[PDB]
Amino acid sequence: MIYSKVFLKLHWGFSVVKPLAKPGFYLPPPTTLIGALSYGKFRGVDNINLGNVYGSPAYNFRNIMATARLESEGVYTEDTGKVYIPNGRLVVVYVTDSISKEELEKLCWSITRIGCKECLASVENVEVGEAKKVSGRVKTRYYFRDTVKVVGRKEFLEYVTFWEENGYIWGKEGSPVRYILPITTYPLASKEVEVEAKEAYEVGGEYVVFS
């Protein structure tokens, strides 16, 4: 298992509109992270034949783990949900075991937007390393699944929903999956939470929980 860390310098903020009134999302979903990662290699094509239908030029990377967190305070607005956080900083962690270290390192230097067109985001630095798997009690900031149990005080658990990879194809709706965010509703911020992780990877001082 290998892992990478990125330091993104947002320009004004991202934007993602919920499926099915156009409210947005507090933090980018995993699908957007995977797509932003894949953008580097597929720069110039918007349709690839999956063998049955054209769904997206990102179905290749549908088996990579990723999470992200904020390093500042942001304000959520509805005026089309937006999360204004100009000049802020986003920290994204990729956990993967498919490609070699050089591939991921070069890809991580090839991200220039998360969300829609306007969500320009520079990249400040990247780190690459190995991960050690454990199952003991840990403290984490990156969001996790709804199925994960909680040991600490129930104070900042926000319940949201996401879609599986099946949504990469048009004319279809991805399955709904519950997720938990350790966030403060207003102002937006990131707070640590203790968890009895069954499968968590240590990625250089921060523990990440996936199940």
Partner RNA sequence: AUUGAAAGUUCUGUUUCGAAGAAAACCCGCCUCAGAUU
| Shortest CB 55 distance to RNA, Å | 8
CB of 19 to RNA, least distance (A): 4
Contact call for residue 163 and RNA (CB under 7 A): yes
3-state secondary structure of 40: coil
**Cα dihedral 72, 58, 2, 208 sign:** positive
Applying CB under 7 A, which of residues 38, 67, 96, 190 lies at the interface with RNA? 38
Q: DSSP string covering 141-205, please?
A: -S-EETTS---S-SSSEEEEEEE-GGGGSTT--PPEEEEEEEB-SSSB-B--EEEE-SSEEE-SS
Distance, in Å, from the CA atom of 49 to the CA atom of 59, rounded to the nearest integer, reads 10
Residue 53 sits in the site that holds RNA (CB under 7 A): no
Q: Of these, 1, 116, 135, 187, which contacts RNA (CB under 7 A)?
A: 116
Q: Would you count residue 131 as binding RNA (CB under 7 A)?
A: no
Instruction: Single out the residue of 13, 29, 74, 88 in contact with RNA (rule: CB under 7 A).
Output: 29
3-state SS assignment for residue 105:
helix
Binding part of the chain for RNA, among 3-11, 13-21, 68-76, 192-200 by CB under 7 A, reads: 13-21
- Show the binding pattern over residues 60-99: x = contacts RNA (CB under 7 A), - = does not: ----------------------------------------
Residue (of 77, 85, 37, 28) closest to 57 by Cα position: 37
